Design a protein around this ligand. Sequence first.
Ligand SMILES: [Zn+2]
Lengths: 100, 115, 69, 55, 68, 96, 112
Amino acid sequence: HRIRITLTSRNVKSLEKVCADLIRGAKEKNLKVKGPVRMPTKTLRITTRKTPCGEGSKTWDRFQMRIHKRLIDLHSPSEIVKQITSISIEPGVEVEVTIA
Amino acid sequence: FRKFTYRGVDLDQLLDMSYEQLMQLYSARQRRRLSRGLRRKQHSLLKRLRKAKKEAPPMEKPEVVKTHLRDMIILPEMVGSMVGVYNGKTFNQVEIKPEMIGHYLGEFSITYKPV
Amino acid sequence: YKIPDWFLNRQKDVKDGKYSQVLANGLDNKLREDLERLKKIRAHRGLRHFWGLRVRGQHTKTTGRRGRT
Amino acid sequence: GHQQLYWSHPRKFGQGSRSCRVCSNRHGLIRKYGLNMCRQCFRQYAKDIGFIKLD
Amino acid sequence: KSYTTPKKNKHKRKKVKLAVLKYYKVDENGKISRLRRECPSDECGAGVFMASHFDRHYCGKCCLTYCF
Amino acid sequence: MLMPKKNRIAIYELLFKEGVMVAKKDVHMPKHPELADKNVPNLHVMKAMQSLKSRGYVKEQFAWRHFYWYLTNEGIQYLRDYLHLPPEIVPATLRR
Amino acid sequence: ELNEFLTRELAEDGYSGVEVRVTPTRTEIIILATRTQNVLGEKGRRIRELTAVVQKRFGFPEGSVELYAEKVATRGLCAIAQAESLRYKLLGGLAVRRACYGVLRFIMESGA
RNA sequence: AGCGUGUGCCUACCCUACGCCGGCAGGCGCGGGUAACCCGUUGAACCCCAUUCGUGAUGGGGAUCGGGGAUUGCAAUUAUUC
RNA sequence: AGGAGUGGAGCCUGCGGCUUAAUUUGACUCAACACGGGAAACCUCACCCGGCCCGGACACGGACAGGAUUGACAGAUUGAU
Ligand SMILES: [Zn+2]
């Protein structure tokens, strides 16, 4: 009865807040829960040009997009995981449930 | 003065022999022109020029055929005709012979002048 | 003496098509008859060889200053 | 006639096959991560996609 | 505007008055007499008429050249 | 504009049940994606729609490829006159 | 894309801004405006029309999107809405000095 | 060694491990991956050791040319690349 | 004070110049000369040689079902079944 939930978001502080919420919920549900696994992050490096024309100094810029994906491991039955997945949502994260 | 040879074969040997060993007879670059597949997508130009070549002329110079298309190989049954290659502006009337078989039709040109 | 056929300086010759090693004076004869054949068919490559121009596709707009004059 | 002369060039590859998502132009195209964007409209529409400049 | 080269004409449908009696031959007795053939396929019926050439023939939309 | 008799019927019946339509600006596009039941280019579709807005029966704005055509009430009255249905019916965007 | 659509389309109503919501089987987006009587037309005609627009343009199932109308107080914060309001106040024609000093007085009375 | 990249929306153009043909650019079956897993433990170059070297425009230097063979695309001739 | 280099040699590329069917152009000190993200075989293309479709919406007034466009298979032409 191994079930896993993957947590990804645009931001990092909201991600840690949501991860703390699910960890605290699995702690008050009184079950065997693994702690928050800290997956490495990925950095989107985008380089464009400042000038619409070809006039002036050759001044590039650097564009950074930070993606932060995490996962937690649960040992709960399916309906409880579905209920805590369907509760406490936000428009920053995506919920995703794997049964394995 | 002496009968020419084209890597072993002669003029009539090029004339009577078909595509499936003519491809090995000329170079590998010209194999890629015919080895891709069926030539019936938009080959109305190709078919009409083959029929116009296959039209038998009387005892004179053959009928002139000119096209804006450039991509052809000098074929053994194609020689003996009067063709005008589309050299940019006007169809440049050139004379052909069964000697440059295995080459392209666009490699007979001069642009304006040397400066 | 059992050499591979691709390891030869010229392949598919005009004279016979047999792949063979071509001697030094033979190489000079082959080059001069090839230039004469391209000149006789008055091809673009033979014309650029006559004029001393470029066939292998490189730009002489900025280089090749040691040619005419 | 033109029903069989519109499609002489099937737009499968080359520069004219792909175009920007904004102005139907084919210069300065961004194809990394599937933006399909020109660089200037990517700049003026970079803030609202969830991007902030850090470095 | 215009160049020195003259413009090219196009096949326009010329105005012919009362060509419907050219469909069938109007006889005395009430039986239709026809000088034309039809397209025997099921894609176009006998209501569609054909192209009156002198030696060859043409269907409605099938482009089937009927010759002798 | 040269387009078949059934085509304008399909366009107007799509306009009735769907009061707005979208179309991507391309001329080399023989199939309309939303109107999947009949093969139609969108070229004659926005030809008919620019005819309607230019004679002043539907509104018009442009976005990026995609026009958005909001039918005015008098345009709906004209189209229901053209298809000769009684005006008791409504487009599907009016039912609550 | 939808934001630029909304500032293109809602060009006479005072469009403020939107924030999308990522939710399965109900893809809700909330629209901020200034005149909520001019976003609906005749009892929700324009709102459901825009719903049909986003459905048939972005490939959504039947009734998945829902458009929510909300108002925000203290209008001086939203600058793009303020720029569109000064566009409203100079679309026909006025001197820039008097209307600009009036909107300066308004945005300093707002508490900037 | 490390920052990276990845099956596409009209999208087919992804990374390729593994086994045969071939001197080689390459050709065919064979599995995986929507990604610290699969490429990959990224067995990189520059380095270190042992030969061929020895001042002659030499074994430095690869610009000069033609022939032959693969791959891309609807098609590369004024060489596409190799 | 010092290290690495260009300008010397061969190659790559941009511009000036001559130019032709045109070799389309913008930019001449810092703030252009591997720049417009531009490594141009098709597209690119806006330069030149050569023709088809209307994308004249819409309105006025004449043609109009006894018919108005458009779409065509032997064969001469072209750049095309
Ligand atoms: Zn028929």
